[PDB]
Amino acid sequence: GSHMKQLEDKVEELLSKNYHLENEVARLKYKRNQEEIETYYEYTLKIEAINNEMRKFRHDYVNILTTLSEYIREDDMPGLRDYFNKNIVPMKDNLQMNAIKLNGIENLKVREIKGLITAKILRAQEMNIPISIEIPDEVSSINLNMIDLSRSIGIILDNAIEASTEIDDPIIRVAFIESENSVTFIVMNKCADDGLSTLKEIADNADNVLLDTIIENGFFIQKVEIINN
Amino acid sequence: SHMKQLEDKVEELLSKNYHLENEVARLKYKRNQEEIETYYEYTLKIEAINNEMRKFRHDYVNILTTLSEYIREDDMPGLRDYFNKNIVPMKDNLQMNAIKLNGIENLKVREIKGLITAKILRAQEMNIPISIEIPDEVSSINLNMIDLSRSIGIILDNAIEASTEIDDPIIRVAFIESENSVTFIVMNKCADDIPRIHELFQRGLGLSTLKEIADNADNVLLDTIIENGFFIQKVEIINN
Numbered sequence A: 001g002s003h004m005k006q007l008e009d010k011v012e013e014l015l016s017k018n019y020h021l022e023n024e025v026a027r028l029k030y031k032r033n034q035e036e037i038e039t040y041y042e043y044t045l046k047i048e049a050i051n052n053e054m055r056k057f058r059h060d061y062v063n064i065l066t067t068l069s070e071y072i073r074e075d076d077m078p079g080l081r082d083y084f085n086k087n088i089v090p091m092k093d094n095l096q097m098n099a100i101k102l103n104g105i106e107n108l109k110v111r112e113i114k115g116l117i118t119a120k121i122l123r124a125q126e127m128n129i130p131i132s133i134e135i136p137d138e139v140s141s142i143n144l145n146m147i148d149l150s151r152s153i154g155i156i157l158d159n160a161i162e163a164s165t166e167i168d169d170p171i172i173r174v175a176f177i178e179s180e181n182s183v184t185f186i187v188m189n190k191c192a193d194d195g196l197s198t199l200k201e202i203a204d205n206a207d208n209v210l211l212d213t214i215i216e217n218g219f220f221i222q223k224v225e226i227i228n229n
Numbered sequence B: 001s002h003m004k005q006l007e008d009k010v011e012e013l014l015s016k017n018y019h020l021e022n023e024v025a026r027l028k029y030k031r032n033q034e035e036i037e038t039y040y041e042y043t044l045k046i047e048a049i050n051n052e053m054r055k056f057r058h059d060y061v062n063i064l065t066t067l068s069e070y071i072r073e074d075d076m077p078g079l080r081d082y083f084n085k086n087i088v089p090m091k092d093n094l095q096m097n098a099i100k101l102n103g104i105e106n107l108k109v110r111e112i113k114g115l116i117t118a119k120i121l122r123a124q125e126m127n128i129p130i131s132i133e134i135p136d137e138v139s140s141i142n143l144n145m146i147d148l149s150r151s152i153g154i155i156l157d158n159a160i161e162a163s164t165e166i167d168d169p170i171i172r173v174a175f176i177e178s179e180n181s182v183t184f185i186v187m188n189k190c191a192d193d194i195p196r197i198h199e200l201f202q203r204g205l206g207l208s209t210l211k212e213i214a215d216n217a218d219n220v221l222l223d224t225i226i227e228n229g230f231f232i233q234k235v236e237i238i239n240n
Helices: A002-030 A034-073 A077-093 A111-126 A146-163 A197-204 B002-065 B068-072 B076-087 B090-104 B110-125 B145-161 B204-215
Strands: A131-134 A172-178 A182-190 A209-215 A219-227 B130-133 B171-177 B181-189 B220-227 B230-238
Touching: A002 B002, A034 A077, A034 A111, A034 A146, A034 B002, A034 B076, A034 B090, A034 B110, A034 B145, A077 B002, A077 B068, A077 B076, A111 A131, A111 A146, A111 A172, A146 A172, A146 A182, A146 A197, A146 A219, A197 A209, B002 B076, B002 B110, B068 B076, B090 B110, B090 B130, B110 B130, B110 B145, B110 B171, B145 B171, B145 B181, B145 B204, B145 B230, B204 B220
Parallel strands: A131 A172, B130 B171
Antiparallel strands: A172 A182, A182 A219, A209 A219, B171 B181, B181 B230, B220 B230
């Protein structure tokens, strides 16, 4: 009767349970720790930023050495003095209060995204593709995990850069726009005469990520709006 | 009796599930401790590299400011002389430095490209001659991210510390791929002057927690060679 029923049901239920626990032991012993791997990816994004910062610094310093060289070869002490007072004393001083003044890549306060854009600016500079950065306001935060935000931005700039190679007098423009409601990443490039799948995957698994495209008179636009939580 | 059995069964399945549930919980704790070690290890490593790079950058900007004397004295002859003798050669060393970094393009394992570039920048800014050779693209290495990363780091950090004392240091790095496996090699010039024992005790600990990683994978073969005055560290990682 209902004792036997319930007792037989019990030995069944406990066997199911024993099965699912045996599966959880097996997953924890043998499948990859997704979380530990995500910590490792996030670490790689930091060290890429650090590497790309030091490369930009080397590129920048070489240009300062070129400029000084030129002044010296022109025998132009007035210019050298003016340039040193205006560019190299401030660089040495390195005052925080001069942060209110800086309005370009210097206002991107997410270290990992700043390094990533620094790399794309350097890649473009190698291939004689001019690249403007418009970040009028400081951008301290973006409501997307670092891994997806990183892949998204890099693919959009990879598109722009590949598209700029088959062209005379190209240009790429980049902007970060903060409202009260969202952060918006825009990339425009000049067009010729007319991967990106993993990017659509990301926008479709996020309700706050709106991916937009525009063809506007001999230049292509990619836009990502990210809404605050 | 028949029924005394099921009552006996439920008892013994409940006991089994208890033990399993203790196992799951002990493994969740082991995984938790591991996530923690990985986060603090890698967050400390970022701090030490970030602070080293800043120092390098500080030295660079200091050098620019040694021109200040010459400018205030309105002395262009002393500037031209000082610059063309002390400062301007940096820009050649920096252009060569940028060229050597193009040696890493064939590394298509994003997992470790940042790690390797960072050791190369570090060696370059310590004025240790370094080259990297990857004759064919390498897009797949058959060892976990974390252990590959720890192995590479130890070997490159060993080659770099051992190179700071020496008069003419060289480090050579390579990734080669057969169709069988991938091999990672770091050659560095052995020192002539051997350190006093007391100026070395508080690499050898790190070489053993490298053997740790090599022993606990059958498909990774570690080799340590001395050959014509070079320490060679080879790690072969088979696609078995």
